[PDB]
């Protein structure tokens with residue numbers, strides 16, 4: 001039964017009067033409508049036993065009532081005090097409101113207190129996070145579209161680097177984001193990374209206007225937003241023939257990531273999935289250089305639940321989405337990472353990106 | 363008054379004990395420290411008669427003394443509770459705090475209340491907007507740098523559309539932003555607009571993957587961020603030879619804009635600046651199709667003060683920075699806008715951009 005009926009069940013169980021939801025991502029997940037309120041006010045109000053209302057600026061009202069359903073919509077003009085309009089549409093005794101503690105600024109809560117009195121505010125964010133851990137088949141299709149665009153990014157990026165003739169890290173970044181803009185993509189899901197040689201072992205490194213080094217490795221970490229959903233992936237290639245040491249580090253990381261991918265299925269635990277990759281790299285003598293958890297969740301944002309880390313005994317179940325991204329980073333010498341995100345099926349998993357994992361030579 | 367002296371005199375006049383300033387653009391504006399703190403806590407604290415203090419995360423502590431002087435800097439470890447460090451470091455009594463009411467979220471004012479008690483909060487933002495309304499000489503150099511980048515975008519945009527061969531509005535936008543990226547520009551200051559023929563008359567049109575039209579006009583509205591400051595301009599050209607109706611509409615807009623630039627100087631009012639261009643368009647027979655104010659302010663953002671609009675009797679002063687952008691939009695037929703931003707000198711004004719204003723044919 002619907003997300004809205006789940007939130008309304010929460011309110012009765014905890015004896016809270018209504019919500020006032022403000023985050024534009026949450027608003028899109030819950031209503032289907034992507035709204036950019038910027039400076040003005042917009043809120044979603046859900047009750048224990050009454051029709052949910054949706055309060056927007058006067059200009060967005062008609063757009064909103066063609067592209068949502070089940071909602072009671074009304075608005076306000078710059079000539080009005082918005083909290084007075086809201087007050088004129090709620091005629092009950094409000095003594096508690098559920099809001100999102102990390103998003104709602106002081107002006108909104110004070111403006112709200114000025115009408116309904118001395119409110120007791122309750123945090124709604126933990127329940128929203130929990131509803132997002134399991135994805136529907138409809139959600140997984142959209143994330144598959146974002147994955148296809150991440151695969152095109154690699155082909156364009158490898159080809160741009162192989163032309164040499166003075167090409168730099170920033171030159172390659174710009175060319176990649178040029179092609180995505182041409183195909184209609186609205187933005188990247190995080191800052192695009194292209195790092196040459198020893199520069200790939202720095203955890204704070206950033207693409208700059210430095211020429212890529214011959215006979216060294218090149219790291220690409222990238223991702224896009226499409227239809228409100230995200231993608232994330234990493235691949236490490238070679239520019240000319242590398243030396244024997246750097247090719248052996250790449251083999252270790254490669255086999256470690258494929259072993260975690262052949263192990264994931266419902267019934268195992270997050271701790272166990274981290275351990276497959278980490279034990280393999282530790283047994284080979286490079287444990288002190290794999291210094292972060294194996295993976296993180298993904299969905300509308302690039303960083304959600306669950307956490308694939310030690311000490312987490314959560315049971316993996318069908319529908320979850322998360323990243324699988326081991327690495328070895330050795331300062332001044334070399335750094336390598338290989339990354340996919342995936343979704344969990346009834347007897348296994350499938351990955352969102354398909355580009356080759358081997359050490360290709362350009 | 364230095365900027366710090368100005369905040370503190372405010373506190374003595376209003377009987378407030380101290381500040382907790384949190385927005386990173388404000389932080390940069392007041393001290394020269396530009397940091398991106400994500401979810402960790404940073405705060406600037408000024409007093410009525412006592413040395414200012416600055417609270418940052420344990421990382422940023424010594425990159426903070428790189429860029430600031432005269433401030434007692436100190437930090438906190440991820441294993442610590444930040445508001446506790448703040449409470450044990452402030453050894454005077456606090457019952458009231460000045461903050462930025464639009465920026466500071468609920469979790470942070472509740473974190474402060476649990477350490478200091480029942481705080482009375484007071485809004486500092488009206489004062490920052492009054493300090494930002496007049497620009498210093500150093501601020502104007504940086505805005506000129508951002509304006510030159512906008513002239514370079516026009517050179518690139520005209521050339522790309524001259525090539526024809528099926529090029530579209532969205533092809534043209536991608537090439538503009540590609541080139542800015544290669545030069546190290548962090549981002550644009552708003553969504554770039556390229557609109558062809560009758561599509562420029564839509565008040566809500568947007569670049570799309572459709573071929574530009576021969577023998578019609580083409581509109582370019584664009585700007586960048588550089589060094590923490592913004593820019594904004596518009597030009598309108600022709601693709602092939604235009605018709606006589608569209609060329610006379612361009613001439614009317616050209617003269618209206620140039621007329622307002624020769625009028626602006628200290629002493630006149632904002633209402634009078636709007637009327638100079640508006641009367642010219644009205645007397646030529648198209649007043650019904652000039653349906654927005656003549657300009658807005660510019661600085662760190664593109665949406666600040668003063669407002670150039672009927673009814674605003676504010677007096678213009680040396681050092682104010684605003685836009686000058688009349689236009690005519692006739693549904694189904696044509697749209698033209700021409701736009702510069704400017705700074706007011708001791709006896710006139712000067713423009714931030716220099717690209718030609720005439721109707722050029724590519």
Ligand SMILES: [Mn+2]
Nearest residue numbers: 221232233234
């Ligand atoms: Mn990644």
Ligand SMILES: [Mn+2]
Nearest residue numbers: 232323325339
């Ligand atoms: Mn990742």
Ligand SMILES: [Mn+2]
Nearest residue numbers: 594658685687
């Ligand atoms: Mn403007």
Ligand SMILES: [Mn+2]
Nearest residue numbers: 583584594595
């Ligand atoms: Mn503009």
